[model samples]
Target: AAQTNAPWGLARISSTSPGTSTYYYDESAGQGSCVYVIDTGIEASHPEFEGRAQMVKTYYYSSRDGNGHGTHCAGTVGSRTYGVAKKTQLFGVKVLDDNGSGQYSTIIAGMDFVASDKNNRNCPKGVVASLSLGGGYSSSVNSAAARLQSSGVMVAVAAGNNNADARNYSPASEPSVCTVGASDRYDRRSSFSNYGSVLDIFGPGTDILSTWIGGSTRSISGTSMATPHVAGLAAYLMTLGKTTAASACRYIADTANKGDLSNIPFGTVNLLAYNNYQA
Candidate 1:
């Protein structure tokens, strides 16, 4: 599709090379300034993202690149200046392996690693985490994620690709976690997007083409893409000096233009409690 009268917000359709660049420029600052992505592995050789992305620690708890999902997701979040925050620095924490299945403990271990590493002498400050995976809602996982959130690590997760009415899964359901719902090119709730009271905000997701692990481009559709939009936006907000996830989430809600809702009702969210202005 070339273009359309997207009713929700900005459609995720246009393509000419700056795939993720435009979105990043609009929402995120430059080079993430230093943001950490928790995923499989970034294809460092890709022309669009080469010399622009790096990994911090690779957790092998289901780690290893077999399925391209993690790689593609990573590319969407921080490949070159194309993702949400194009110039953002990225780190990989491979929790899910090629099988595309990981235990809850695996993810917790990743979060725990980030929390512990921050205390390290050379660890980068403000290491925000982007988790584009989730499943079966759980209070236990939500609790763990919230604790991480309280510790200054901003965690973002996909609301889920399931169209079911209920909220998707743990982590995203957590109050502290920035649960991102999916909006089509026009800002309407994607028919395939899962939603619930737990969702924090919405971002571009449906039919998104991102970098695959094997230096390829794949078109994927899900809240996973939306999660990074929020995640990258958070990183940008952080660069401008908003640290806490709560504050970042508030900024999205507060700053997002709220006129293009085609399905989801309006006034359902505060929309912009975390907005910031430079002092």
Candidate 2:
């Protein structure tokens, strides 16, 4: 297939050569799965979303993004042009505010919304969550994320950008969650991405392009960006029958680009998330 002009992140994961200059993905592109963006919020109008993305919760009293972080993450998860799961339904669960920060309870409330939504209707029962936010250890936050995973949401979380141990972070450290670190286009660990035993895998995060506010697009960096890539893969995995979070995580890790990443910190798995593209 000719290049669709996807970002390096997408091109990097979908092929073994990674020199294709295009993203090679399964035709399904994550149809029949749901992904929750638990972040600042999403600019639902971003043309990249093609109407598939929306702010499903207003924990912050508005249905828009002020920080742009959430929109970027959502795009990588499943925007038409730059997404991993290009066809998956994207639901923005606004937990962090415009400043890109939130307390434990606010974050938990967002997860609660997702859980209830899962049990109810509209959203397909196959669920995955992209959590690109994290902070100091919080037992409450950890329990909430763990419980969310147990309830069937395959939660992929950021390993934090602290350039240190991910085990010190809340949801990232939660045993049941899929904690992700950042790898660059060269397949090297992003210098600032957190690491250690808590990380499940790495994904393209440096200078990665995706959707932004005002119907636009932009490139940003962080383990934040890395987590959603894995979330998108999890969505696609669900469509392939790995419905639960644990099962999806297992397949993601097992099918990842093994030993291809460099500088993976000590104690962290050297796996990089791949989309299992047929090409």
Candidate 3:
């Protein structure tokens, strides 16, 4: 049997990624749910993916994970070693260029692509959309995310790497999406994390270790890193039959580990939590 390594983030959540268990965790871990990484791109050939990632290019750039940010986030969401839902199908939706810069239109175009049938290659039972990219607030992008959610896509977005009010950002400030912030291994908010009422939850973002480009693993920091942890959890929750984005969000809010944080804005509401497969 493949014993659970219990990645640091997974340990914090009291959860473990699926590998070898006497019983199946759920459909989500058995090809029932799909996790999409919306960022620079993903190294679709990485061993962590085990040849399960589908790469979709939204821009002129080849969806080959030039910057490595997207692959790292993807690994945290679904790779066997660093993931939360190890068996879920992975998809790479490239919206940013090699410089890690993208236009709002590119983002909307990528969202539109996923919203359409062009993404049904795997016949996913449910969709968990993870976006670690962010910029100044844009109502248009917010509207697009709402549309996707209405169409049954669960959206998990970063609260931005800037240490400012998350309300000033777009998808992070947008309603109906999970706005994630960064926390350290000790559960303290990362110094660069954006917080406030708009924050949805916090996850281990500082010094996060996950699959990187070039067939290796590395650690990076940001709410960008934190967003996918929730995305992976959302995908795992879907396996337990929590399908919709709203429902997954509710489950996360209701079941998260509580009272572990204090003296911070929305600290009680923003406390860290994870799935504990203590068995």
Candidate 4:
């Protein structure tokens, strides 16, 4: 028996697409929008994506998901079953290697590649950069995100799995990027999620079921898991005609479920993530 009409995260935010019992929105399926998952890589054969996933670039390894993390993230961003966009063009821009590790330079290179016109391609609406990997904060990565935002690409990053303040992490702490932390289905912040003002939003990160390497499915948890939810939501926003990165970021922040944080705090109020959305 189905417990929800849409993904729990999507259902919470009212960001569901049409043709279902869930809240109806434009049936764009994020068409004309593109999301580049900058991570380990993607299992090009993942069935959930139904061939929409493509490998556009690689930095430290072949553009194949040996780590499985990238494939999972890609699934959440655009997979037909587990994705938010469902119909968006999903590209894998490999930064981390098989060991699920990459140098900061390599990661930055991947971001720079995806931001380039040659790789990002001018979509009719806009693009999104979904990053599920991060280390300590770096000016280079922050600058890359700034450049991508300036170029009209929305950036979403994991807040980190350390449960510390996200302000201590890179990319997540990066002001230009939307730093996403983890929340369970109970609307509580995941015990492993980072907090603080650097945290931009929370998403269903606990026990998230999504595609894995080798055409399988799996459940995983982390701020990494929370990141693609926001990434996909950004793509969905793009499908709704919020084309510019700045506009989409503003709209997401302004419209997110405003008082959902159970343990984390941004100030007097809890920080918002992608709990709920309009349009």
Candidate 5:
């Protein structure tokens, strides 16, 4: 069913030696690539994150997610080699706090910070911004996301966990956003995944394992885990050629395999396949 035989990285790990021919590197090299992770602050010292947490910038925007939702998210995208795009740098923005709640204004402010660097530094150009939170679709709130998209910043947002229409969430429902739905190990829509015409693609969500507090690893569930798969893959594709976020988004969709929608609800975006490549 593949259009071409170009290698895609689907195997989790290879049995061959690290530098052997059997070991496939998605791209020639991963140097000089990065991504922006807008969620809770990362653990910073996680062994998996230490050498690679290139701090383009860090912010403390809110004081929520105390129960570890934000940390869990950061781990999924930037927790060292454990993450999908392990080599990608993290621009950790703390919009949600220890309590896992943030105002729309705070999220907007974080976006503004990423769009431009007021102090004569770059705005972490050419990085995918992974947003795993949702407050329902809001054109007003999406102004920042639109700007980022226009300026070539790629955003991957979580379709709300509510298994309802896509309009039920704000940023997820926004046309400018690349909304992600969750799926189980069997590649079916997760029982809790929200479906709609707005969803761009899907990723593993049930019983997923990712980084957590104190550099430890834990297993949780939700579109949060799925969002990073696309985010990380975007970063990897960025290595191949697409430098801007929007460009990477297009490549990801073009390269991915189509998803089965036998049970997908109407009014939802037909789920596109993921870029599950073989080496």
Candidate 6:
């Protein structure tokens, strides 16, 4: 009954064993939930989406993704082949440009857009967001995240790829966001991942394979990739009625499998993101 033919990150979260080669998930898998990719635009036409992915808003002046970062993140969140919550409706909130770069203002604008939709009738189901971008600490950005959480949207952000303490970063250090770190298939902390007590959990990050531009697939490594897995899990939990950010955050931490990870550094918790599927 185990799924051994999926991506390693998907397999890793559902099982308690370290370096698991299989996955387990509910057949429903986030149906009727929604996830916002707050980055470069998604290639909505990507084959992985099966026409489910669409642009909800665009801050980068266009909805097309010249950079594949958001598409890859979208794939990890709910793509047919690479997703954690395979049925969740994916909305691209393009805050970053084709270079995969954006200012806090643009990012916050995207957050505001997502927050504005929590009470809208069109999105009757739960909502969550994936933000794989960050920088030095900023009150404005942190406030935006706090507002997003208070507005009933759960968010997962990167702890950072700086290989330093996550507390030194903005949204990663923000208590309102679910900060994610990077781990390898062997359960080792990735050398470039930021760590600290601020991190909510870790996820498979190194050399991850996911959907890319032009209907292709590629492998890349970074905390950027880890954040979406958590976002996808949040979306999955959303379908189970953990609709509020507070409830979803607590549920994820409480149900997470304790690490078989070998090098969870000081200040980082032993918890890794999980989907509560039996190992």
lDDT of each: 0.61, 0.85, 0.76, 0.77, 0.62, 0.85
Give the Cα error of residue 166 in candidate 2, in Å: 0.6
Worst 10 residues of 5 by lDDT: 12-21
Could you give candidate 2's per-residue lDDT for residues 151-239 as a string of tens digits?
A: 88888999999998988888889978899999988888998999899788888899999888888888899999999999998887777
lDDT of 3 by residue, 218-256 (tens): 988989888998898888877767555557766787677
In model 3, where is the ten-residue run with the lowest total lDDT?
A: 16-25
Model 5 agreement with the true structure over 1-85: per-residue lDDT tens digits: 1212211112221211111112234543234555566776666656867666533444453333234565566666656434555
Q: Identify the runs in model 2 with alpha carbons over 4 angstroms from their true place.
A: 1-3, 18-20
Per-residue accuracy of model 6 over 208-264 as CA lDDT, tens digit each: 889999999888999999999999998887776755556776678888877667678
Residue 241 in candidate 3, Cα distance off native in Å: 1.5
The residue-by-residue lDDT of candidate 4 on 1-279, one tens digit each, is 122466665555463221233533356778888899999888877778888888988885367788899999999888877777878888888889988898988887787787785343756777888989888878887787777777767889898999787777778778777888888777788899888776667777988878899899888889888899888888887777754667766677777766765776545225444424334
Task: Name the regions of candidate 3 deviating beyond 4 angstroms.
Answer: 1-5, 15-30, 118-124, 266-268, 276-278
lDDT (0-100) at residue 217 of candidate 3? 95
Which one wins by TM-score: 4 or 5?
Answer: 4
lDDT of 1 by residue, 1-279 (tens): 112332122233122111222221333343334455565555566675667665556656433455677666666665653465555666666777666677888777877877676555232325567778778877777777787777777777777777764354677778767777776654468787766677767777777777776677877788777777677667766665645455766666666645444576443342311223322
The CA-based lDDT of model 2 is what? 0.85
Better of 3 and 6 by lDDT: 6
Worst 10 residues of 1 by lDDT: 15-24
| Whole-model alpha-carbon lDDT for candidate 1 | 0.61
